[PDB]
């Protein structure tokens, strides 16, 4: 249940979604 | 009595008399940066870099990097009287015998993942938008060394606790790959370990490379990297006022000191939650590293996973030219430098095959580049295959497929899947281009039908431009700018009526606010329009 | 542009004059709330303030869940195990939740109160003016031709020899300290002072040493070894046995350093003591040189696999495979551990076995192959 | 200043145009050798060449005295001891003399061939021009007064609470991990687990432990602590003795950890078993509390001195002084080790001495004072 | 090593401003402890020459 | 055949086309410093610091900073079988068991 494979899943769909999804809220679309 | 008005001018005059930074502060306080969400993807790799410096300095003065054997005799009850290295005892003392020590240790591993993830996302902005073409070539190369260093700086990081999962990665990578090199392979192994594996001097060498040297190089490359984007006037997408020699965006002092400083507060806030809630590297579960035991598997973190999958998929191909041998592990060491050589030297490959040696300051929208979009997603789909073939001890167990069938979908798929993602993305990109031409020639497809009085279902397009005396619109010209496809995005939705979420404002204060919304989104619209006509 | 006029210019006309110097032209800059009596401005300055008060309330919570909390480690079957397991999650949703809400509360001050300004700045990039390209190229070349170094082919030629023979001096002094010799005779075997990769711990120190195939009693390093009878295991016992040189023993500090050099410093020591079932012996192929390296359905192959050197521990007693956990090579134990899958290309090194006169398992000497994962100087 | 004229301006005329933009006026600049063939130019261009060829020869020597020199360590009375003592000097006068001679030759190129120039540059410091001072103070304040933060008293007050409670959150979470309690009960003594700095190894674990005054047999790392008879030393003892658990012994790895925590991991253990001659006994002044802590012209004072904790070891057998090498305190062994000199103001903690029934030296417990170098929470 | 016992363990033990509470904060325990030199190796490589080179 | 004049002109046109360090570099180059012997005294502390970098990056490739006890059993004959820390044994491996490691250690202290 541990190891670096659930680290990678819980990074891209939690940490980088909430880092891109914040960047899409701060920045604009042009 | 405090004033903070006379003191703000009497101190600002003391700086501007001893020094004189006002003719130099203003030129970098009127600096204009383009507001776009993709242009904040590089800041995630920078704001996670600072957290790795801050949380790293904390546990630098708790970690003991030797390999001297010592029994535990501490607080963790399954590890009692166990022969462990001193690097694994003082990594079990940070986790267990320091107030808030596991937290700082966990934030520091999650920030190491957000560092390496938001490099790969940021490479994907630079590659697909074409932000590397004429002036930014050296900034790609100074850039792409930070990816190669972040592969190894992270790999030298979790090798330090000397875990059982982590030690078998050193036996695989630094002792198996770097011993089958054909010119000298055994001489390089004694120049890295001081002897045969494990030795005694490895983890102190991997501690000085990891604290002094490689962050000394990464921080020196970043300072050379951010200077080449501060002093080369950051690229922008084409649009209304964007004309190849302007930077149409927002300044530095009121805005972008706030929206880039508040964004640093949120990226630290996300890593504070992930370092607190989600456990990352439980090195107390698997025991200390000793060369007579293994775990159920062995795999690196996700940035070094494509090298592990590259080991697993190349078959047992060895040559034996003479009384020597050339093992299977050299196919990765020549297959890792070949990937890094194509990624450093890419802006010089594309200008050789296209002749694109003109000064570019407007980004290519990546649907307008159907080949490099397709070559890129070829290289994502090869990365995504090599990083899923290194965890085929988990796909076999949890997804119930096989342990033999997962390598053959990784071997047959290594040729097939980069070849059928090149096709479907060269044909996705052109099929987005034709969607941008059905919205210029005909207009935005509004949903409303209107049956005519003789049958004749029609669609009532919105023309996005001038009209003819006949009902057809004049065709506009494409200009690299994103076109709207939906009518709500053209402001046809309206305002829901101001007030709270439950109780409304008295509607005299509504018509005074929504009038200032159609007079600030229209004063802004006649500001770009009277500036676009000033240029042309 | 002159001090006679700067004494009466307003603050807005000085921002515009500060942008004409840099080419910066704010085309549009209108404040967010032009209507003074609004009542929706008053509920969005609290909507900003509610996030900043949460950043102070959570930082005050992080100050109090750090001091006043049972941070002490408690074991699994204890009383305060649950209250310990909420220490580091409470260090996260009080630290990180504060500046997540100061980060939201400062974006919402930019989205809602700092006025939306669209600035256009002409980048002057691409090419320097001619009055600056030429006064540098006529300054670097005058510093090189006025130096009179090109006419002096004796100073400039001996400087390249001087910096070359010094650059060859340091790069050998900086590197040649850590260039060890990998084939230096170190390990004192029966043949006398072999290399390191050619020796494995099963190599006999003299002619008749009789290394024992001794297992351990769990956690092999600090545990004393014990000898192994051949009737110990039954059908695929796969017991890991270590080189016990019949004079080490445990109990004293002088001869406890031997057992850590067999395991925790000793790679290529462990071998698997595979016991083939007697019902399937006709489906066993011996190797060419290694024809009689067994003693009665007991095979001894190494755990150290023949590709990058992880210990191949998983055995799967039904079908005789030696599946390795790292890169999954699947050596076929009935066929001299020839790999039938995976990236590995070579067989595991087989160890000979002969029973002792007392009745214990003894190796007949070292392997035929080096156990290591294919260094360049390997014969095959 | 215009591209039509920069095509014909010579290389000298562009340096003067490149300096007037920067404010640099080369007043005097004249080449070193105005006469072409002088025969003194030809001997100072070889003299520069000889120092550069000296580096290219001494740097090549450092390549050859590094690889081809017997650098191996040799003992003091060996055969190749002289060639080892010239290893690191031969690394010094070949590395360092190479770039000293390259550095000398590169100065002698600047002193003799690069032309002497006197350039004057007007520093424009002291104050910015008014157009730059005014378009910054009106640019900083327009991003503050136009930002409408001054009128919003709710946000700016909760931002100070918000950032203040986060600055007091990190600076406790970043610092309060390494703050320990000096008075936590750790050492399990007979008086109910007293804290550290009141335990010094001589504190008995129970009532009748009888810690022996055991010396070391030289090189006290792996040396067993032999006992000490009170008649072993004649006069002027100076025998550093240590606590002995009388359950350790020597040889086993379990009890060898008790002697590693005895000396190297345990400070304020060693005391001086000083023996007084019987001729001077009336000139002994006992302490008011430490009246009967002696047995037959013997005394036991700590090596750890009463000021900054260096081991006091110098004995001074003529006039009894306990001079310590770090800061020269000079305690007086006839006067309960009261200081005669130095920065030390406190005496040394005497250990009581009593013979065993067998006839060995036994301590009667701990000291009266703590041994340490005057910590803050000290009773004395 | 006696220079550390003199300076860092004698001067820091008698400061009246806070007391001996700092002595357990830069040694991790009584002198010599176990985390002295790996804390003096971290400061001396990155922490102090990262401030010297920044200054 | 190499030229080093046309090859150095097209390199300067390449730097000044990507970047534009023309007016920026010339003001730095045309910087005037006073020639006085006392004004080189700060450069000795600037040049001794670079030597501490270069000989200190070397010196941490061989140093093990722990305090865990271990007997010596190495090459220096008086200190054989002495309970020492590993910080002291590798400081005796730089001096003795590294080729020219005593030199780089002594340069780094001077
Ligand atoms: C959970 C895993 C992930 C965790 C990450 C969480 C954070 C990720 C997103 C962060 C969003 C930014 C945050 C600030 C924005 C605030 C909104 C705002 O004021 O302005 C609107 C803002 C305006 O943007 P703009 O710059 O002005 O211009 C946009 C244009 O107007 C119009 O633009 P448009 O036309 O182009 O399209 C707009 C929209 C396109 O439209 C949309 O798609 C809307 C999407 C709605 C999001 C729904 C909630 C998100 C997560 C759902 C989880 C449900 C629980 C399941 C648990 C299962 C248990 C069995 O595109 C976006 O906004 C991009 C959003 C990117 C996120 C997509 C997520 C992808 C993967 C989802 C997996 C989630 C992880 C699961 C892991 C395992 C489970 C734990 O628009 C938004 O950003 C909306 C975002 C919606 C998120 C709101 C919720 C915050 C997330 C925290 C949740 C915790 C609180 C809930 C409990 C408390 C109860 C009181
Ligand atoms: C600018 C940014 C460009 C680069 C993006 C960098 C950051 C990306 C993340 C941010 C996304 C946030 C966002 O949505 O913002 C809205 C944003 C708003 O646009 P805007 O703000 O108005 O301004 C931007 C430009 O003006 C408007 O620019 P544009 O709209 O004209 O261009 C959009 C698009 C350009 O449009 C394209 O041409 C895309 C071409 C299609 C590529 C996908 C085809 C592959 C499908 C394979 C199917 C295989 C079987 C086929 C069966 C047939 C034969 C049997 O951009 C791309 O280049 C897409 C990147 C291509 C990578 C696709 C990965 C392929 C690997 C396949 C995985 C399978 C292997 C697993 C084993 O719209 C976007 O730009 C979207 C960006 C693209 C999304 C990236 C998605 C890629 C994810 C890769 C990993 C997924 C693998 C799943 C693993 C699970 C295994 C089962
Ligand atoms: C595994 C499970 C994964 C499932 C998880 C999904 C949960 C939902 C979360 C999504 C949150 C999105 C937030 C952003 C929203 C937003 O900003 O929209 C407004 C934004 C602006 O819209 P607008 O108002 O129309 O402004 C007009 C502009 O002029 C620009 O307008 P435009 O129209 O000209 O540009 C439109 C175009 C912009 O161009 C792109 O961005 C291309 C992006 C490519 C997607 C990469 C996916 C990799 C495929 C792997 C296979 O966007 C697209 O059409 C993307 C379509 C995505 C659905 C297709 C999924 C792949 C099909 C695979 C099925 C295989 C069966 C056979 C093949 C079927 C086809 C023959 O629209 C966007 O451009 C957003 C880009 C969408 C990217 C999100 C892709 C989904 C996430 C990854 C999918 C994973 C696939 C794995 C498949 C596994 C094996 C089969
Ligand atoms: C340890 C360390 C930091 C080492 C880095 C040192 C290093 C290697 C430097 C190399 C610098 C390089 C390569 C420079 C080349 C760039 C280049 C083309 C220079 C030519 C100059 C040029 C084009 C025009 C001349 C300009 C001129 C006449 C005057 C400029 C002088 C002025 C006005 C001010 C002084 C410079 C100054 C204070 C700069 C600060 C700007 C910096 C570096 C900010 C850092 C920075 C930060 C902090 C961000 O948050 C950020 C966020 C998002 C995007 C970017 C940035 C970003 O760049
Ligand atoms: C873009 C690119 C690689 C350009 C290079 C072009 C070029 C010059 C190629 C020549 C060099 C060659 C041949 C390279 C081959 C590729 C290779 C071996 C190494 C390159 C590595 C590299 C730089 C990769 C960058 C591309 C990349 C992975 C992602 C770009 C980010 C993008 C576009 C979208 C991210 C979307 C996002 C934030 C979240 C979606 C969530 C999901 C499902 C992400 C998918 C996902 C990913 C991506 C994981 O890495 C991963 C790792 C471990 C566990 C799970 C996952 C996982 O689910
Ligand atoms: C794969 C390695 C990288 C490459 C090839 C790369 C390339 C680039 C390029 C070409 C730009 C400028 C785009 C433009 O001019 O508009 C840029 C911008 C930037 N990069 Fe990177 N970069 C890399 C990694 C990083 C890392 C690791 C950081 C973190 C410090 C970083 C931080 C930034 C910042 C702050 C900017 C300016 C703002 C932005 O455009 O996001 N980059 N990068
Ligand atoms: C910015 C690039 C860096 C990255 C990507 C990185 C990554 C990592 C990773 C993945 C680990 C292992 C975490 C674990 O043990 O669970 C780690 C550990 C460590 N890092 Fe870094 N690091 C970086 C910089 C630094 C710096 C600059 C320092 C010095 C201040 C540092 C000091 C340490 C220490 C002491 C450890 C060991 C702590 C432990 O084992 O828990 N790191 N790092
Ligand atoms: S570990 Fe067995 S093949 Fe790599
Ligand atoms: S240390 Fe000996 S007196 Fe100060």
């Amino acid at each position: 249940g541990f190891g670096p494979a659930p680290e990678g899943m819980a990074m891209w769909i939690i940490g980088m979604v909430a880092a891109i999804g914040v960047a899409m809220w701060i920045g604009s679309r042009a | 009595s405090p004033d903070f008005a006379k003191l703000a001018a009497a101190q600002g005059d003391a700086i501007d008399s001893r020094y004189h930074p006002s003719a130099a502060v203003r030129r970098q306080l009127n600096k204009v940066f383009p507001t776009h969400w993709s242009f904040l993807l590089g800041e995630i790799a920078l704001y996670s870099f600072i957290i790795l410096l801050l949380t790293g300095v904390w546990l630098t003065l708790f970690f003991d990097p030797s390999m001297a054997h010592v029994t535990y005799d501490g607080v963790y009850q399954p590890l009692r009287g166990v022969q462990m290295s001193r690097a694994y005892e003082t990594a079990l003392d940070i986790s267990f015998e320091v107030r808030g020590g596991l937290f700082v240790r966990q934030v520091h591993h999650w920030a190491a993942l957000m560092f390496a993830a938001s490099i790969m996302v940021h490479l994907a902005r630079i590659f697909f938008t074409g932000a590397f073409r004429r002036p930014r070539e050296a900034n790609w190369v100074i850039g792409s060394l930070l990816l190669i260093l972040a592969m190894f700086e992270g790999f030298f990081g979790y090798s330090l606790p000397d875990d059982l999962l982590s030690g078998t990665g050193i036996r695989a990578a630094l002792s198996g790959i770097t011993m089958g090199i054909p010119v000298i392979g055994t001489w390089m192994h004694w120049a890295l370990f001081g002897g045969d594996f494990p030795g005694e001097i490895l983890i102190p060498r991997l501690y000085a490379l990891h604290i002094l040297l490689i962050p000394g190089i990464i921080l020196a490359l970043i300072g050379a990297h951010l200077a080449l984007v501060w002093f080369q006037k950051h690229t922008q997408f084409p649009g209304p006022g964007r004309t190849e020699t302007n930077v149409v965006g927002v300044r530095v002092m009121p805005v972008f000191a706030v929206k880039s400083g508040a964004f640093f507060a949120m990226i630290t806030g996300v890593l504070g939650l992930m370092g607190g809630l989600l456990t990352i590297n439980p090195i107390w579960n698997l025991g200390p590293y000793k060369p007579s035991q293994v775990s159920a598997g062995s795999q690196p973190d996700f940035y070094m996973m494509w090298t592990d999958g590259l080991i697993r998929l190349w078959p047992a191909w060895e040559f034996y030219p003479f009384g020597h041998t050339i093992p299977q592990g050299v196919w990765v060491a020549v297959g890792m430098g070949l990937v890094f050589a194509l990624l450093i030297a890419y802006p010089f490959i594309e200008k050789k095959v296209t002749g694109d040696d003109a000064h570019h300051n407007l980004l290519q929208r990546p649907r307008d580049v159907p080949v490099r979009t397709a070559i890129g997603s070829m290289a994502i789909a090869l990365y995504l295959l090599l990083t899923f073939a290194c965890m085929n001890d988990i796909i076999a167990l949890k997804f119930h497929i096989s342990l033999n069938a997962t390598t053959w979908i990784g071997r047959i798929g290594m040729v097939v899947l980069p070849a059928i993602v090149y096709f479907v993305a060269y044909r996705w990109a052109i099929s987005l281009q034709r969607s941008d031409r059905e919205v210029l020639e005909h207009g935005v497809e509004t949903g409303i039908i209107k049956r005519l009085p003789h049958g004749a279902y029609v669609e009532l397009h919105q023309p996005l431009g001038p009209v003819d005396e006949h009902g057809h619109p004049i065709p506009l010209e494409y200009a690299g700018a994103p076109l709207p496809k939906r009518m709500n995005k053209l402001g046809s939705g309206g305002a829901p009526g101001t007030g709270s979420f439950l109780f409304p404002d008295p509607a005299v204060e509504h018509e005074a606010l929504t009038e200032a919304a159609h007079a600030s989104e229209h004063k802004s619209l006649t500001a770009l329009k009277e500036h676009q006509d000033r240029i042309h | 542009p002159t001090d006679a006029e700067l004494a009466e210019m307003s603050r807005e006309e000085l921002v515009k004059l500060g942008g004409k110097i840099d080419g910066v032209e704010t085309i549009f800059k209108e404040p967010r709330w032009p209507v003074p009596g609004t009542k929706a401005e008053k509920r969005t300055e609290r909507l900003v303030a509610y996030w900043l008060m949460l950043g102070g309330l959570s930082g005050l919570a992080l100050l109090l869940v750090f001091l006043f909390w049972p941070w002490e480690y408690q074991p699994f079957g204890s009383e305060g195990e649950f209250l310990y397991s909420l220490a580091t999650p409470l260090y996260g949703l009080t630290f990180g939740l504060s500046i997540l809400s100061i980060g939201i509360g400062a974006v919402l001050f930019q989205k809602k109160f700092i006025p939306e300004e669209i600035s256009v700045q002409d980048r002057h990039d691409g090419r320097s003016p001619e009055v600056h390209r030429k006064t540098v190229a006529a300054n670097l070349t005058d510093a090189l031709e006025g130096s009179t170094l090109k006419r002096r082919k004796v100073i400039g030629l001996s400087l390249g020899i001087g910096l070359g023979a010094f650059g060859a001096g340091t790069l050998v002094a900086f590197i040649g300290g850590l260039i060890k010799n990998p084939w230096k005779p170190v390990v004192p075997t029966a043949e006398g002072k072999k290399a390191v990769l050619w020796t494995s711990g099963w190599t006999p120190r003299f002619k008749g040493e009789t290394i024992y195939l001794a297992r351990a009693t769990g956690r092999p390093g600090e545990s004393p070894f014990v000898k192994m009878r051949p009737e110990d295991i039954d059908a695929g016992g796969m017991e890991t046995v270590f080189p016990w040189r019949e004079s080490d023993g445990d109990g004293t500090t002088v001869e406890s350093e031997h057992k850590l050099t067999e395991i925790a410093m000793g790679v290529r020591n462990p071998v698997m003591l595979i016991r083939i079932k007697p019902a399937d012996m006709h489906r066993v192929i011996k190797r060419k040189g290694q024809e009689s390296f067994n003693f009665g359905e007991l095979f001894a192959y190494t755990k150290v696999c023949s590709h990058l050197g992880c210990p191949s521990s998983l055995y799967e007693q039904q079908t005789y495979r030696i599946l390795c956990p790292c890169h999954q090579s699947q050596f076929d134990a009935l066929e001299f551990a020839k790999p039938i899958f995976g990236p590995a290309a070579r067989a595991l090194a087989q160890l000979p076995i002969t029973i002792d006169e007392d009745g214990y398992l003894v190796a007949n000497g070292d392997f035929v192959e080096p156990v290591g994962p294919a260094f360049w100087e390997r014969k095959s």
Side-chain angles (χ1 to χ4, degrees), chain A residues 24 29, chain B residues 365 367 428 432 435-436 482-483 485-486 489:
Chain A
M24 297 170 76
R29 289 176 178 84
Chain B
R365 196 183 180 187
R367 71 182 64 186
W428 193 289
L432 290 174
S435 67
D436 285 332
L483 294 165
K485 306 292 177 65
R486 293 179 290 169
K489 297 293 287 184

Side-chain angles (χ1 to χ4, degrees), chain B residues 292-298 392-394 396-397 403, chain C residues 236-240 272 274 301-305 310-333 337 348:
Chain B
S292 299
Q293 294 177 356
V294 288
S295 64
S298 174
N392 57 2
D393 49 356
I394 302 169
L397 181 62
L403 195 143
Chain C
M238 55 79 66
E239 291 290 328
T240 300
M272 290 175 69
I274 293 170
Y301 305 109
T302 62
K303 290 177 76 71
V304 175
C305 65
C310 291
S312 67
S313 293
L314 291 173
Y315 176 69
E316 294 174 351
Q317 295 88 17
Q318 184 65 255
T319 305
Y320 298 94
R321 291 185 180 96
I322 306 195
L323 185 304
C324 184
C326 294
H327 300 88
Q328 294 173 350
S329 297
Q330 295 184 1
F331 304 96
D332 195 4
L348 300 180

Side-chain angles (χ1 to χ4, degrees), chain B residues 421-440:
Chain B
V421 172
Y422 183 80
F423 185 77
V424 79
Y426 181 77
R427 301 290 179 88
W428 193 289
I430 303 169
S431 189
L432 290 174
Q433 294 177 1
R434 297 184 185 273
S435 67
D436 285 332
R437 267 71 173 176
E438 299 295 326
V439 78
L440 295 171

Side-chain angles (χ1 to χ4, degrees), chain C residues 12-78:
Chain C
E12 183 66 29
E13 292 178 353
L14 291 166
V15 177
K16 290 191 286 185
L17 192 273
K20 290 180 181 179
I21 302 167
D22 305 336
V24 184
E25 183 183 2
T26 68
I27 318 165
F28 167 71
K29 182 180 177 183
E30 183 176 359
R32 295 286 188 181
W33 297 102
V35 179
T38 304
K39 194 179 178 181
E41 181 177 359
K42 295 180 179 66
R43 76 188 69 191
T44 186
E45 74 180 4
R46 293 177 295 173
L47 189 148
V48 172
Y50 285 164
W51 288 97
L52 296 173
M53 289 178 184
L54 183 60
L57 191 276
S58 178
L60 189 274
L62 185 273
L63 179 56
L64 297 177
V65 303
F66 187 78
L67 298 174
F68 295 162
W69 191 264
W71 68 278
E72 293 288 332
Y73 174 73
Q74 298 299 112
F76 180 75
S78 177

Side-chain angles (χ1 to χ4, degrees), chain B residues 99 186 233-234 247 249 328, chain C residues 66 119 121 123 307 326 377:
Chain B
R99 301 175 68 96
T186 315
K233 300 285 178 63
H234 192 278
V247 185
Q328 193 270 331
Chain C
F66 187 78
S119 302
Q121 177 180 4
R123 52 166 66 100
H307 171 267
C326 294
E377 293 85 2

Side-chain angles (χ1 to χ4, degrees), chain C residues 93-134:
Chain C
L93 59 91
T94 56
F95 171 78
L97 192 145
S98 68
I99 43 173
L100 186 60
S101 61
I102 302 171
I104 291 167
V107 173
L108 291 175
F109 187 75
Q110 189 266 323
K111 304 293 287 297
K112 263 65 185 298
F113 294 113
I114 298 172
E116 178 180 1
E117 64 101 13
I118 299 171
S119 302
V120 51
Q121 177 180 4
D122 46 353
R123 52 166 66 100
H124 296 287
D125 60 354
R127 185 62 59 86
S128 295
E130 186 69 27
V131 303
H132 297 288
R133 292 179 61 85
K134 190 64 70 69

